[PDB]
C-alpha cells in the first residue's frame, strides 16, 4: 500500500481534544506492551508537544480470549471527520443480512495496519498512555496507518477489501458479506457445520491475502431473533386492580395503535371498589377486550426507517436479569423491540448486564440498518461512566444519554 | 572539545490565519535603555538572542524593572500579544502526583536544571516572531533589534517544550536504571532511590554523566533545603506527608472572600484531616459575586467552623503507599448530604482522607449518595494507586441487596463489606408489589385553578370514607401530592392508594428518603410509619370509578 488517501476534517472544525480517563495499572501495563510493539512495527510514532490533540484509549478483552486489545475511543474524531464517499456514492446496506440463518462476525481491523495514513491527518489520531498518579508524563503517540475504530479506515480500505473478497464472493453468490468499522459480518443459510468451515475458508483468504484476533468468530442467528408485540392478560377472574392495570396499558397502547377502546372495560370499574375485589367481565367488555387483542396482533402503521435520522434505543431494567428495549426514530413508532434474560457473567452485577445489553442491541442495529443507535440508559451517568469500560468487548462504541426519571411505561413491557 | 548531541528542535506554528505580533515599543528613560543594552549584550554573548536587520516586521515591547535590595535592573519582554497568536501545545503538567500514591525512597537528590533550560533551541522558522527593540538614546539612532534563539521566558510554548525536551533526554537513563525514580517540575529534577547513600550519590554522578552528553551542566540544588520539601502545598517528609500548616483565621466579620478562602483551606485540609465539613460554610456563598460582601454566619455555620477548628488543633499526617499491602476505603455518613472517608492499608494509618457532598436536587436518599461517594473514591483511587480499594460501608449487606434488586435503575458497588459504625444507611420504606387484601382502598385526587390558585385535595374509599380540603395558593402538582398525604394521614397501617398523578408517581418511584419540599417530606414521614402501602396508578379522565368520583369532588 503505497499512496495515502487525502483526508480532512469537516469545515471549520479542529481535531479532538478529549481527556484521557484514568486507567488501572493492569490496563496501562497492557497498553505499554502493545504500543511498544506497534511502535517497532511502524504503526504508531512518538509525538512532540507541538501536537495538542487527544483521543482516549483503554484496553479490553474480546469475548472468550485472554489477550488484551487496544481500544481507541474515536467517537469525537469520527464525528469531526469528513463524511466519506470512498469510491462510490455509497454501499447500500444489505437488507438480506438480517434474514440469513447464521451470521458470523470477524475482527478484520488488523488488515487496516497495512495502509498508510495521510501524513497531514496523523496528528489528529494522537493519544496518551497515562501514568499512575501523574508520576511521569503520559506516553504520547500518533498513528502512521489506518487505525482500528476510525470512521475513515473501512472507507479508505474498501477498495482493498472488495478485491480480497471477489474470489470468495464469485464462488459463493448466496453468502452475504457486510463490513462495519473493524468488523466483517458474513451470513449464510447453510448448516453451521459447513458455515464454520466456510468462515474458516474466508479467514485463510484474508490470511493468504495478508492478525491477533482474526481467529475468532462471533456467531449470530438473526433469523431466530424474536420481537415482542404487546400482550394482554388472559384471565378467568379479574380484580379491580387487574382491570385498572389493563386500562392503563391499553391507554398507553392507544398512542401506538388506532382504535383501542377502554370504555366498556372502564364501565366495570363503577363505584369505589376495593382493589382486590373480583369483577366479572360483562359481554360488552369482553368484546372490547377481544377487539383490542386483535388490533394488537397487527403491526404498527407507517413505520419506515428514515436513513437521515438517528436510531434511538431505550432500555428498561425489569429485574431478575431481564431487560426490555425498543428501537425507534420517532416516538411510538418502534422499528424493533426485544427482551433479554440471563446475561451470563453477572447475576449480581446490574451494570455488567446493561453493558452486555447495549452491545447486543448495537449488534442488532448494525445488522438491520448498518449503524449504531443512540442509547437512553436507565442508570446514573457517574455509575455508568465509572464501570462500563470494565465489561466492554466490542471494537465500536455507540453514543448514550441517561434517564434520571423513572418511566411509567416499564410496566407495560413487563 | 567533547562533541555534545544537539537537543531536537520542536517545530512551532502560529494559530492558523494569524500573523506574528506588531506591538509598538514604549519610550524608555535613558537609564533604562543603558541597562537593557548591557543585559542584552551579555545575553547575545551567551547565544540567547541575536541582532537582526530591519526587514523583520514583527515586534514585542521590552521593559526594564527594578527590585528591592538587589539594586539591579532586570529585563522583561512582554510576550502577551505573541502568546495569543501561538498555537496550542500539549501541556504535560496538568496534574501532580498525590503524596499518598508515592512510595518511600531512602535517599532523594534535587538537581538544578535552570541552566540546561537555555540549551533548548527555539525552532528557527519561528524566531522571527520573537523580535524586540531596544530604543536608542535620545531616539537619534536606529533601535537595536534582537530575536531569541532559545525558549523565551514568558512565551506560551516554553514550559511544554522544555519539559518535553528534558523527558526525552532522561528517557534512556530512567529505563536503564529501574532502581531509581526521576521527577521533574519547573527547574527542579528530583531523583530518589532505595540505594545506600554512597551508591545513590553515584547514580547521581552517572546522571550528570548522562546529562553532559547534551552539554547540560547540572550541580546539586544550591542551599539544599532540609526536609521536608515544600512542594505544591505539601510537606513531603521522609516517612510521612502533610499539607503545609493549616491556620484558620480568627474573625468577627466574615466576608465572601474569607469564606471562599476558608473552604479552600478546609478542602485542601480534608485530604488528610478526617471529618472536615463545609456544607453550611459553602452554603453561605450561594449566589454572591461581590467578594467584599459580608455575610452573617448561621449558627449551623459557626458550629461547623468550630468543629473544623477542633479537627485542626493537632496536625495529622498520612503514610506512603506499600503495593504489597491491601488498599481499603471506609466511608461514614455525616448528615445533611455530607460524607467522609479514609483510605488506608493498616488500621489507624491513613494514606489519605476525603469527603463527598450530595448533588443539588429536590429529592434524594442516603443509598444513592453512598453510591455516588463510592464512585468518586473509586475514580480517585484509580488515579492515585491504579486500582480500586476494598470498601467498608455502613450499610447492611441485606439492605443493599433489597435496594439494587428493586431499584428501577441499574446500579453497582464494587467489592465491599459491612462496617457497623452508626449511623447506618437503610431503606426507610418499601412499597408493596401487589394490592393488600383487607386494606382500605383510597382513591385520591387534587386540582387547582391556574388563575386564582385555589385548589382542592381529597379522597374517597371503598368503606365510604371521604375528605375534600380547600386549599389556597396552590397548583395542580401540589394538590396531587396533598391528596396522597391526606390518604396516608387518615388510613390505618396498611393502605391501598389509587392516584392518576404521573407527577407524584415519578417522585415516589424514585424512592426519596428526604426532600427540599416540605410536602414530599411529610409524605415520606407517613410512609415510614406505615406497615404496608400499595400505590397504584390509573390514567385520568377514563371513567375509572372512585377516581372519577374524587376528580369531580376536587375540580370545583
Ligand atoms: C522525587 C520527588 C520529589 C518531590 C518533591 N519535593 C515530589 C515528587 C512527586 C517526586 O517524585 C517521586 N517521589 C516519590 N516518592 C517520595 C516519597 C517521600 N519523599 C520525601 C523525602 C524523602 C527523602 C528525603 S531525604 N532522607 O533524602 O532527606 C527527603 C524527603 C520524597 C520521595 N516516588 C516517585 C515515583 C515516581 S516519581 C516519584
Ligand atoms: Mg383529576
Swiss-Prot record, chain A:
Outcome reported for the amino acid change (mutating residue 186 to I): 25% increase of DNA-directed DNA polymerase activity. No loss of RNA-directed DNA polymerase activity
Consequence when changing residue 150 to Y: 58% loss of DNA-directed DNA polymerase activity. 42% loss of RNA-directed DNA polymerase activity
Outcome after substituting residue 184 to I: 29% loss of DNA-directed DNA polymerase activity. 46% loss of RNA-directed DNA polymerase activity
Coiled coil, from the record: none
Phenotype upon changing residue 400 to L: Almost complete loss of RT p66/p51 heterodimerization
Motif Tryptophan repeat motif: positions: 384-400
Region annotation (RT 'primer grip') ranges: 213-221
Effect seen on changing residue 186 to M: 27% increase of DNA-directed DNA polymerase activity. 10% loss of RNA-directed DNA polymerase activity
Effect after changing residue 252 to T: Complete loss of polymerase activity. 87% loss of RNase H activity
Disulfide bonds: none
Reverse transcriptase domain: residues covered: 41-220
Record note on what altering residue 217 to A does: Complete loss of RNA-dependent DNA polymerase activity. Complete loss of RNA 5'-end and 3'-end cleavages
Annotated effect of mutating residue 71 to V: No loss of polymerase activity. No loss of RNase H activity
Result for mutant: residue 169 to R: In strain: Isolate PV22
Consequence the record notes for mutating residue 62 to R: 10-fold decreased sensitivity to ddATP and ddCTP inhibitors
Effect in UniProt of substituting residue 248 to A: Complete loss of polymerase activity. 25% loss of RNase H activity
Effect of residue 392 to L: Decreased RT p66/p51 heterodimerization
Outcome after substituting residue 181 to V: 58% loss of polymerase activity. No loss of RNase H activity
Effect seen on changing residue 387 to F: No effect on RT p66/p51 heterodimerization
Phenotypic consequence of residue 183 to N: Loss of pyrophosphorolysis (reverse of the polymerase reaction). No effect on RNase H activity
Impact when changing residue 154 to G: 34% loss of polymerase activity. No loss of RNase H activity
Binding site for Mg(2+) 1: 107, 182-183
Protein name: p51 RT
Organism encoding this protein: Human immunodeficiency virus type 1 group M subtype B (isolate BH10)
Lineage: Viruses, Riboviria, Pararnavirae, Artverviricota, Revtraviricetes
Gene this chain is encoded by: gag-pol
Amino acid at each position: 500500500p503505497i499512496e495515502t488517501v487525502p483526508v480532512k476534517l469537516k469545515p471549520g472544525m479542529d481535531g479532538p481534544k478529549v481527556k484521557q480517563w484514568p486507567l488501572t495499572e493492569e490496563k496501562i501495563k497492557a497498553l505499554v506492551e502493545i504500543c511498544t510493539e506497534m511502535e517497532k512495527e511502524g504503526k504508531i510514532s512518538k509525538i512532540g508537544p507541538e501536537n495538542p490533540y487527544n483521543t482516549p484509549v483503554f484496553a479490553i478483552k474480546k469475548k472468550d480470549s485472554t489477550k488484551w486489545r487496544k481500544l481507541v475511543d474515536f467517537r469525537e474524531l469520527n464525528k469531526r471527520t469528513q463524511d466519506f464517499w470512498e469510491v462510490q456514492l455509497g454501499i447500500p446496506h444489505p437488507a438480506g443480512l438480517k434474514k440469513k440463518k447464521s451470521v458470523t462476525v470477524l475482527d478484520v481491523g488488523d488488515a487496516y495496519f497495512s495502509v498508510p495514513l495521510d501524513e497531514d491527518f496523523r496528528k489528529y489520531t494522537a493519544f496518551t498512555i497515562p501514568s499512575i498518579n501523574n508520576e511521569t508524563p503520559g506516553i504520547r503517540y500518533q498513528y502512521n496507518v489506518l487505525p482500528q475504530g476510525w470512521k475513515g479506515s473501512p472507507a479508505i480500505f474498501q477498495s482493498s477489501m472488495t478485491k480480497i473478497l471477489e474470489p470468495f464472493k464469485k464462488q459463493n453468490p448466496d453468502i452475504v458479506i457486510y463490513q462495519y468499522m473493524d468488523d466483517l459480518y458474513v451470513g449464510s443459510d447453510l448448516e453451521i457445520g459447513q458455515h464454520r468451515t466456510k468462515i474458516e475458508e474466508l479467514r485463510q483468504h484474508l490470511l493468504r491475502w495478508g492478525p491477533p484476533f482474526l481467529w475468532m468468530g462471533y456467531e449470530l442467528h438473526p433469523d431466530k431473533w424474536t420481537v415482542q408485540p404487546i400482550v394482554l392478560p388472559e384471565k378467568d377472574s379479574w380484580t379491580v386492580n387487574d382491570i385498572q392495570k389493563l386500562v392503563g396499558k391499553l391507554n398507553w397502547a392507544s398512542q401506538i395503535y388506532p382504535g383501542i377502546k377502554v370504555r366498556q372495560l372502564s364501565k366495570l370499574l363503577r363505584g369505589t371498589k376495593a382493589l382486590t375485589e373480583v369483577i366479572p367481565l360483562t359481554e360488552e367488555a369482553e368484546l372490547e377486550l377481544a377487539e383490542n387483542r386483535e388490533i394488537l396482533k397487527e403491526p404498527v402503521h407507517g413505520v419506515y426507517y428514515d436513513p437521515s435520522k438517528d436510531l434511538i434505543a431505550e432500555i428498561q431494567k425489569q429485574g431478575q436479569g431481564q431487560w426490555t428495549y425498543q428501537i425507534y426514530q420517532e416516538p411510538f413508532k418502534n422499528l424493533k423491540t426485544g427482551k433479554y434474560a440471563r446475561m451470563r457473567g453477572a447475576h449480581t452485577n446490574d451494570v455488567k448486564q446493561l453493558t452486555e445489553a447495549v452491545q447486543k442491541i448495537t449488534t442488532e442495529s448494525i445488522v438491520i440498518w448498518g449503524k449504531t443507535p443512540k442509547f437512553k440508559l436507565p442508570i446514573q451517568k457517574e455509575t455508568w461512566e465509572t464501570w462500563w469500560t470494565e465489561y466492554w468487548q466490542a471494537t465500536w462504541i455507540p453514543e448514550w444519554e441517561f434517564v434520571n426519571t423513572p418511566p411509567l411505561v416499564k410496566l407495560w413491557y413487563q | 572539545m567533547v562533541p555534545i548531541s544537539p537537543i531536537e528542535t520542536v517545530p512551532v506554528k502560529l494559530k492558523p490565519g494569524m500573523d506574528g505580533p506588531k506591538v509598538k515599543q514604549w519610550p524608555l528613560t535613558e537609564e533604562k535603555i543603558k541597562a537593557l543594552v548591557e543585559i542584552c549584550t551579555e545575553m547575545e554573548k551567551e547565544g540567547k538572542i541575536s541582532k537582526i536587520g530591519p526587514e523583520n516586521p514583527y515586534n514585542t515591547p521590552v521593559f526594564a524593572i527594578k527590585k528591592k535590595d538587589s539594586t539591579k535592573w532586570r529585563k522583561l519582554v512582554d510576550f502577551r500579544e505573541l502568546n495569543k497568536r501561538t498555537q496550542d501545545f500539549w501541556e504535560v503538567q496538568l496534574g501532580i502526583p498525590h503524596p499518598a500514591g508515592l512510595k518511600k525512597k531512602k535517599s532523594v537528590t534535587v538537581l538544578d536544571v535552570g541552566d540546561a533550560y537555555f540549551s533548548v533551541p527555539l525552532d528557527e522558522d519561528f524566531r522571527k516572531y520573537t523580535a524586540f527593540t531596544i530604543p536608542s538614546i535620545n531616539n537619534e539612532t536606529p533601535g537595536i533589534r534582537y530575536q531569541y534563539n532559545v525558549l523565551p521566558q514568558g512565551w506560551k510554548g516554553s514550559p511544554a517544550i522544555f519539559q518535553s525536551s528534558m523527558t526525552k533526554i532522561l528517557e534512556p537513563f530512567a529505563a536503564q536504571n529501574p532502581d531509581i525514580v526521576i521527577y521533574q517540575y519547573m527547574d527542579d529534577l528530583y531523583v530518589g532511590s532505595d540505594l545506600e547513600i554512597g551508591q545513590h550519590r553515584t547514580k547521581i554522578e552517572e546522571l550528570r554523566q548522562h546529562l553532559l552528553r547534551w552539554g547540560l551542566t547540572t550541580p546539586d540544588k544550591k542551599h539544599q533545603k532540609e526536609p521536608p520539601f515544600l512542594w505544591m502545598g505539601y510537606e513531603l517528609h521522609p516517612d510521612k506527608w502533610t499539607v503545609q500548616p493549616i491556620v484558620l483565621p480568627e474573625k468577627d466579620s466574615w466576608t465572601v472572600n474569607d469564606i471562599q478562602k476558608l473552604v479552600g483551606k478546609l478542602n485542601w485540609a480534608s485530604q488528610i484531616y478526617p471529618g472536615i465539613k463545609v456544607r453550611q460554610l459553602s452554603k453561605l456563598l450561594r449566589g454572591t459575586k461581590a467578594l467584599t460582601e459580608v455575610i452573617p454566619l448561621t449558627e449551623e455555620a459557626e458550629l461547623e467552623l468550630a468543629e473544623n477548628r477542633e479537627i485542626l488543633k493537632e496536625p495529622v499526617h498520612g503514610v506512603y503507599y506499600d503495593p504489597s499491602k491491601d488498599l481499603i476505603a471506609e466511608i461514614q455518613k455525616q448528615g445533611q448530604g455530607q460524607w467522609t472517608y479514609q483510605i488506608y492499608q493498616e488500621p489507624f494509618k491513613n494514606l489519605k482522607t476525603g469527603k463527598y457532598a450530595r448533588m443539588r436536587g429536590a429529592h434524594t436518599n442516603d443509598v444513592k449518595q453512598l453510591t455516588e461517594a463510592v464512585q468518586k473514591i473509586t475514580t480517585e483511587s484509580i488515579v492515585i494507586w491504579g486500582k480500586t480499594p476494598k470498601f467498608k460501608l455502613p450499610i447492611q449487606k441485606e439492605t443493599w441487596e433489597t435496594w439494587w434488586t428493586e431499584y428501577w435503575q441499574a446500579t453497582w458497588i464494587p467489592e465491599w463489606e459491612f462496617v457497623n459504625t452508626p449511623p447506618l444507611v437503610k431503606l426507610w420504606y418499601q412499597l408493596e408489589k401487589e394490592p393488600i387484601v383487607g386494606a382500605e382502598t383510597f382513591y385520591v385526587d387534587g386540582a387547582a385553578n391556574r388563575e386564582t390558585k385555589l385548589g382542592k385535595a381529597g379522597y374517597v374509599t371503598n368503606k365510604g370514607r371521604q375528605k375534600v380540603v380547600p386549599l389556597t395558593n396552590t397548583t395542580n402538582q401540589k394538590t396531587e401530592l396533598q391528596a396522597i398525604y391526606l390518604a396516608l394521614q387518615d388510613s390505618g397501617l396498611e393502605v391501598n392508594i389509587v392516584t392518576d398523578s404521573q407527577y407524584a408517581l415519578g417522585i415516589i418511584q424514585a424512592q426519596p428518603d428526604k426532600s427540599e419540599s416540605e410536602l414530599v417530606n411529610q409524605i415520606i414521614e407517613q410512609l415510614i410509619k406505615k406497615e404496608k402501602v400499595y400505590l397504584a396508578w390509573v390514567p385520568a379522565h377514563k371513567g375509572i370509578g372512585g377516581n372519577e368520583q374524587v376528580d369531580k369532588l376536587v375540580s370545583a
